[PDB]
């Protein structure tokens, strides 16, 4: 299948003096890197996080990021002074950067920037641009950022060349983690559903990887159309948690089963009878 490599930067600027930048890196829904503000170096969160980079290529790439993090912090502080007093502290800046990998040497790279939680700027082709809906005052920051040909050449290289090359290596090195199968375990429970005579049956499903799963409340062969899947919730061990609720009438509980289909079960569906 297709995998998106996502480098997520969160930068908080409380006032002229105080700031922190924290980064996490995801390949699909698996974390590959962490870079805490407190750490001089990027941390691997998998044995295979260096992908197929030599030690010298990785050291070179890390050194570039180390200079970037310091430079970025000063650049934002200077841009605030430049736009003063239009924009003031506190300021949150987020970057989402990476590449989506497609079959047959195809990929697309992205670098999106959010200011105070709104997507306002991307890197596109050879320059920074504002996106539809961004405020006009960003034209000055963009003009200043776009004067820096050295940064533009580096960003172009990272998006066009480094990202897809690095990620092709990660996919090879991490293949056995990315393709892991972990079995769901299910269990049932019930509560009042703020309706006089109505019960809410809950089917809990936990420990499954990967994410795609099917969970249905059932009377025999009849799929209970009232079934509501909650959100996919993460477990600490890089597996998933999901619950499916059914609002029933007190007494009708008898005859209901919860059925779970998952790739890990090799066709042996879980059926739990209330």
């Amino acid at each position, epitope marked *: 299948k297709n995998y998106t490599f996502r480098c997520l930067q969160m930068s908080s600027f409380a006032n002229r003096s105080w700031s922190r930048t924290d980064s996490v890196v995801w390949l699909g829904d698996l974390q590959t890197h962490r870079w805490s503000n407190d750490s001089a170096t990027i941390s691997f969160t998998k044995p295979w996080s260096q992908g197929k980079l030599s030690n010298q290529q990785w050291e070179k790439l890390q050194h570039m990021f180390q*200079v970037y993090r*310091v*430079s970025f912090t*000063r*650049d934002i502080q*200077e*841009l605030v*002074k*430049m736009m*003063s007093p239009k924009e003031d502290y506190p300021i949150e800046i987020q970057l989402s950067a990476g590449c989506e990998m497609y079959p047959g040497n195809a990929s697309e790279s992205f670098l999106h920037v959010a200011f105070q939680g709104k997507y306002v700027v991307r890197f596109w082709g050879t320059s920074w641009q504002t996106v539809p809906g961004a405020p006009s005052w960003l034209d*000055l920051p963009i*003009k*200043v*950022l*776009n*004067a*820096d*040909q*050295g*940064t533009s050449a580096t960003v172009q290289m990272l998006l066009n060349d480094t990202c897809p090359l690095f990620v092709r290596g990660l996919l090879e090195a991490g293949k056995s983690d990315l393709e892991k199968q972990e079995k769901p375990v299910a269990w049932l429970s019930s509560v009042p559903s703020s309706a006089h005579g109505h019960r809410q049956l809950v089917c809990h499903v936990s420990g499954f990887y990967p994410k795609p799963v099917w969970v249905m409340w059932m009377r025999g062969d009849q799929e209970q159309q009232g079934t509501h899947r909650g959100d996919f919730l993460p477990n600490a061990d890089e597996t998933w948690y999901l619950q499916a609720t059914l609002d029933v009438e007190a007494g009708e509980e008898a005859g209901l089963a919860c059925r779970v289909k998952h790739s890990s079960l090799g066709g042996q569906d879980i059926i739990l009878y209330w």
Partner: T-cell receptor
Amino acid sequence: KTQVEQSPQSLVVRQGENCVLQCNYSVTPDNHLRWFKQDTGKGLVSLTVLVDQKDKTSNGRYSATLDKDAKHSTLHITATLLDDTATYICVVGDRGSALGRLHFGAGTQLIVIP
Amino acid sequence: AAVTQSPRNKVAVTGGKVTLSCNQTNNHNNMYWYRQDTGHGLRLIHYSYGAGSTEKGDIPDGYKASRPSQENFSLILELATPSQTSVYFCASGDEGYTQYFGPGTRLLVLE
């Protein structure tokens, strides 16, 4: 003591001799490096700016090198004239935009005996 | 892209008020004040990103900056001291890295 160091501090050459001036820096990042000539009680005249990881420039009798890996630049003056008597100043800009700070060396004093 | 400074030379007394003026007709947003002392490179005192903006540089103590217009950037020594005897350089620039330097001002503060 500082982020930009020039050597020699000063030197005396005879007209027609060549000389080499050195600039070493710790500035990070190093977007570009400029050589200024400053005549006594006058202002800053740009001789050259170097921008590439390994760079070479020329401007008449002036030539310069930059090696960003070594953080080292040389200014070569071929066939010195009386009018080369000046202070030569190395400057490193830490950005390719107005967000940059300039880091100035304290200069090399050249005297050319006519 | 020209930059002018006035005065070009000033003798002042300790405790007196001295204003160093820089004028720039390039329509540059950005202006910068430095001092040059023997044994040092130029050192940044104050800078400005536009009218009404003043920012402290590396050595702002004993100086006030004023940017009343796009054209004019002034360095004010409210209580001049002998330590402010120096050559003062103004520069201007747009979004690019190039700073265009004025010709310098020689200030001597006598006791």
